[PDB]
Symmetry: D2
Subunit: 199 residues, 4 copies
């Protein structure tokens, strides 16, 4: 089973380089993740890490005026980003993620699911078991849909609307990797040996 | 309304830089697209052109062994790609797009809808009316969902599974823009004055 | 020996995908290039192709007002490149190469030598003998220097000034590779098998 | 005048984000840099900062086995970089910069000059006075040439050899900017406001 409330709990359990650790605590609390073969666990974290962090801090910033707020309480600010020459990207985060999350009032539950769908990426290269990873993705989204239809009955197209925030998350995610400024927001790509302390 | 059969007919009307022309014919036949402010029509094609083209050829290549097949009948081939130093990206198209479309046997109707959802991108910068473009996207996906419930009732999660092919389409789309080789598959970014004969 | 007039002849013999052909005829005519092991001949052209061609068209454009002029007589134009969304990079070619070439009135002979320095790139990965390639670059620059002291004795720092046009040519060279527009000016990266008809 | 020993002293005065401070102290000690309009001083530093820091750490690493050595005593290590997925670029620094500096035994004085040449980049966008910036460059290189003919009379082509390390320094420089990893080596692009404490 892939119970929504257990994803909700996972999000809560971690509600505020240390980023990585709190990422790993989160992932372990997602149903079944830990039952994946260990190398696949590494791969899925090395692949999704930046999307996962961006999605979290975007949600966190829903109430923040101006910029974004990190879990470490680092408060970034739009102009600080513009001065670092990453304004276009930064505004993208604000407009395509933070704003959209705000206007539809995204649940902590819905966030968890989106990040779980991101986590369970069957397209990540090197997986011993792509098909197992695809099935967990499927169990996350089915559960998310039920959740939306039960909790938000007056909004028939809310599910899809959450889904369609993922291409944006994907663009932003790639672009962030290309400007050193963003190291201050999401660190660099996690190293194998280190992640392997998910063991 | 946003009737799927009219999207299906749009796809068929164009079934085999001439690429741009046939893209434009396609877009015209999507319900309401032409009712958009003309500058918005231009932005939406400039933004989506490459995803729209890759999505098209990927679906066309469902049957093809080895590589991908273009509407001009140029048949590319995996080795040609690897020779050109774009193998990683090329294999991403085959793995994340072509193969997934093949395994799920994507409808020409489902292709049309995904492509229309891509066309009606509310995040495209410069739109005089994002709000209106958002609503058309919403009319497309709702209409695609009923269609999947109608036509594939034994596959509860098929709608989401189609949607979740869009972040892949988005990464592949951006990576393609970074290798000269791909000019031979999708040309370069269309220029406004030129698109402006959607008038 | 590495006699400058033989490089000058090389330049002239080719003075106006066919691009690659005329690049190959050019390199053959550079003293000693053909004495290089044939795999190193391939590597050097595959590495330097884009800078070699940009350098060529930049010099040919010294006279042209507005934009740049290709050997095929394609005349690009500054607006056309800005409409294509590659204005910044195009402007760099005009400002950092074309203009500097014009102000200093670069020789055909000095063009030949710079391009031969670029062709004998000892840093090219996979060379069977980087040391031999280094020595040919050495024979080109020493030969260039004598020629500058002989022909422009009024200008003590002209040699260096020509050399320092190379970091820019390396910048522009890389940036060109990331925008499909430039396929129209330099093609894509040459493929091994094809170049191998240097045999 | 542009006396080489004053550049030598500049290098020495700084011999071991704090990075930027020591960069600023360095620049100030370069003859005439401080005479430049203040806005131009910020531009040249914002433009050259990465090349300047890379070239410094490269030279510092001449003796180090294995990897690179930072002024802060951070000792990076080849496989450390390979694990972070930046092995190709890292190898480039080692082969194209550190190795070549080693084999030719580059002087601290020759380092100073090369870095001065890089600092005095007349191609930097936004300069109020690119002509004045060009002249200081010229005074550095002429001065570097006499120094090389005085100090290394047995090596006629040493000057050109040093110069020809600059395109490499430019390639590496750009590529470094595209991987979050390197924020650990060079921080990100310096901000206007902050550099303006050159005042």
């Amino acid at each position: 089973d892939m119970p929504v409330e257990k994803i909700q709990e996972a999000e809560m359990a971690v509600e505020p380089d240390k980023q990585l650790v709190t990422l790993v605590e989160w992932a372990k609390r997602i149903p079944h993740f830990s039952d994946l073969p260990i190398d696949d666990q590494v791969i899925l974290l090395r692949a999704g890490w930046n999307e996962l962090l961006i999605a979290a801090f975007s949600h966190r910033s829903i109430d923040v005026k101006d910029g974004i707020l990190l879990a470490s309480g680092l408060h970034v600010h739009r102009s600080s980003a513009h001065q670092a020459g990453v304004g276009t990207i930064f505004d993208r985060v604000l407009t395509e993620l933070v704003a959209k999350m705000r206007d539809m009032k995204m649940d902590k539950t819905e966030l968890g699911c989106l990040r779980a769908i991101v986590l369970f990426n069957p397209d990540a290269k090197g997986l011993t078991d792509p098909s197992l990873v695809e099935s967990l993705r499927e169990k996350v989204y089915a559960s998310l849909e039920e959740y939306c239809k039960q909790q938000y009955p007056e909004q028939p197209g809310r599910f899809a609307k959450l889904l369609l925030r993922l291409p944006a998350l994907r663009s932003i995610g790639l672009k962030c990797l290309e400007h050193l400024f963003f190291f201050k927001l999401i660190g660099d790509t996690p190293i194998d040996t280190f992640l392997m302390e998910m063991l």
